[PDB]
């Protein structure tokens, strides 16, 4: 069966680094073999190869933030195994006034087992932009 997903971003009062998502706007959940759990992770029910992707857009400033880049990581929790990092991207903070906008895009082919969950986290969630289109997260089974 056709097993794919795409969920839009959603701001929250969390502080914690894990980005929140929602089945809203032009979202996709093909069937119950992919699920969005607690707004934070796309969990699969069948073993195999998936192309997982995510796009973080953020506005940041070099003076306001600490001397350290914006890192977005796409992580994997498999059942009965430790956390794992799959993809990462790093961007220096801009020198632009109020803030400087930039987008990251992560995408890759990984092997998910049954019950495996993937999620996207960031260094500073307060800097993540959440306008229509700008920040999204998805998956599709080969």
């Amino acid at each position: 069966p056709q097993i794919a997903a795409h969920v839009i971003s959603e701001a929250s009062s969390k502080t914690t680094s894990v980005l929140q998502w929602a089945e809203k706007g032009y979202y996709t959940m093909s069937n119950n073999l992919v699920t969005l759990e607690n707004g934070k992770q796309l969990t699969v029910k069948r073993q195999g190869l998936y192309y997982i992707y995510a796009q973080v857009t953020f506005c940041s400033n070099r003076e306001a933030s600490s001397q350290a880049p914006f890192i977005a990581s796409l992580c994997l929790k498999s059942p009965g195994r430790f956390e794992r990092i799959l993809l990462r991207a790093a961007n220096t903070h801009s020198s632009a006034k109020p803030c400087g906008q930039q987008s990251i895009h992560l995408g890759g082919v990984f092997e998910l087992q049954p019950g495996a969950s993937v999620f996207v986290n960031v260094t500073d969630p307060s800097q993540v932009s959440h306008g229509t289109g700008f920040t999204s997260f998805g998956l599709l089974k080969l």
Binding site: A11, S12, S13, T57, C59, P98, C99, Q101, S126, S129, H130, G131, T132, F134
Partner: protein, 87 residues
């Protein structure tokens, strides 16, 4: 849209949406409603869509404001009211 979620003793999540027009820079302005004077103002990208306020006084009725700018042209000042809790 201009919603106010997760209001607690000292904090509150402001959110909005990209429906107004092709604006770029906005001013999130807030302060105590009807205690005339002290107002905090915050420069934000229009498409950022969120700000979390902190260091608010408890049991206090606040007032939020959001005007947005494209060059010299400016948007319809979109207001909202909220009251913090207590403990």
């Amino acid at each position: 849209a201009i919603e106010v979620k997760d209001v607690t003793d000292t904090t509150a999540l402001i959110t909005w949406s990209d429906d107004f027009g092709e604006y770029v820079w906005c001013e999130l302005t807030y302060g105590i409603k009807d205690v005339p004077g002290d107002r905090t103002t915050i420069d934000l990208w229009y498409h950022h869509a969120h700000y979390s306020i902190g260091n608010l006084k408890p049991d206090t009725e606040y007032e939020v404001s959001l005007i947005c700018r494209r060059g010299d042209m400016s948007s319809n000042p979109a207001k909202e009211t909220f009251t913090t809790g207590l403990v």
